[PDB]
């Protein structure tokens, strides 16, 4: 069959905060809310692993997982909170079922976007009080920026 083969390991256990500047903090193993970290090892530490098929757009796509377990944020639909899925061991060959946890990352200087490879109109938006979801973006901050913690 056609496999989407892992391209390269980027950075890991680094946390992304948006223009609201809120650390993506772990509330549950299914629901996550953005809040500025205060325990530091409190936000979910993600790691990027790229896969390759010629079905991106103009940008190469990686999977966002917590460095310890394989909790991926999947793209649902419209403004519906991302469901953190947990599956033992990272796949090396990607089929047509994990297209939600795939992310088209468009980086502009310092800021960066996270586009859904599943549904194009989806973008990962950041809320002041609610869970970090995906959206079509009217005045929701669907901006991101990668800020690392000290230790």
């Amino acid at each position: 069959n056609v496999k989407y083969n892992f391209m390269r390991i980027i950075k890991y256990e680094f946390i992304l905060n948006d223009a609201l500047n809120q650390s993506i903090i772990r509330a549950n193993d299914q629901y996550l809310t953005a809040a500025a970290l205060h325990n530091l090892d409190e936000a979910v530490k993600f790691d990027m692993g790229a896969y390759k098929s010629s079905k991106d757009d103009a940008k190469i796509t990686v999977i966002l997982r917590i460095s310890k377990t394989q909790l991926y944020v999947t793209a649902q639909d419209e403004d519906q909170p991302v469901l953190l899925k947990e599956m033992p061991e990272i796949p090396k060959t990607i089929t047509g079922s994990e297209t939600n946890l795939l992310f088209f990352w468009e980086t502009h200087g310092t800021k960066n976007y996270f586009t859904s490879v599943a549904h194009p109109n989806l973008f990962i938006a950041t809320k002041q009080d609610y869970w970090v979801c995906l959206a079509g973006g009217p005045p929701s901050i669907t901006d991101f920026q990668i800020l690392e913690n000290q230790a």
Partner: protein, 98 residues
């Protein structure tokens, strides 16, 4: 974040969820079944129910219709309805349950 035991019509519809979710959680997207899980059930679980374990495709396409191989939030449902119906009036206009 957990549906504890429910009322009766819920007992009947929740029950539909849990089984469903067991497979939906197996592969990618724990909220949707892939074309392989559909094929597994259709082939393995459905020979008795859906006497069309071969060309799963047709039904798949009808559910998949958005070219979303994820049998999700009441896209799958069409089949689920065909399911509850089929068990009852499969060709049961003479006899099918015995």
């Amino acid at each position: 974040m957990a549906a504890e035991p429910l009322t009766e019509l819920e007992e009947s519809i929740e029950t539909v969820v849990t089984t469903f979710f067991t497979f939906a959680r197996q592969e990618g997207r724990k909220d949707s079944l892939s074309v392989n899980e559909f094929k597994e059930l259709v082939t393995q679980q459905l020979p008795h129910l859906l006497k069309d374990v071969g060309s799963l495709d047709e039904k798949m396409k009808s559910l998949d219709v958005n070219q979303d191989s994820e049998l999700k939030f009441n896209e799958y449902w069409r089949l689920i309805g065909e399911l509850a119906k089929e068990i009852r009036k499969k060709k049961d206009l003479k006899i099918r349950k015995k």
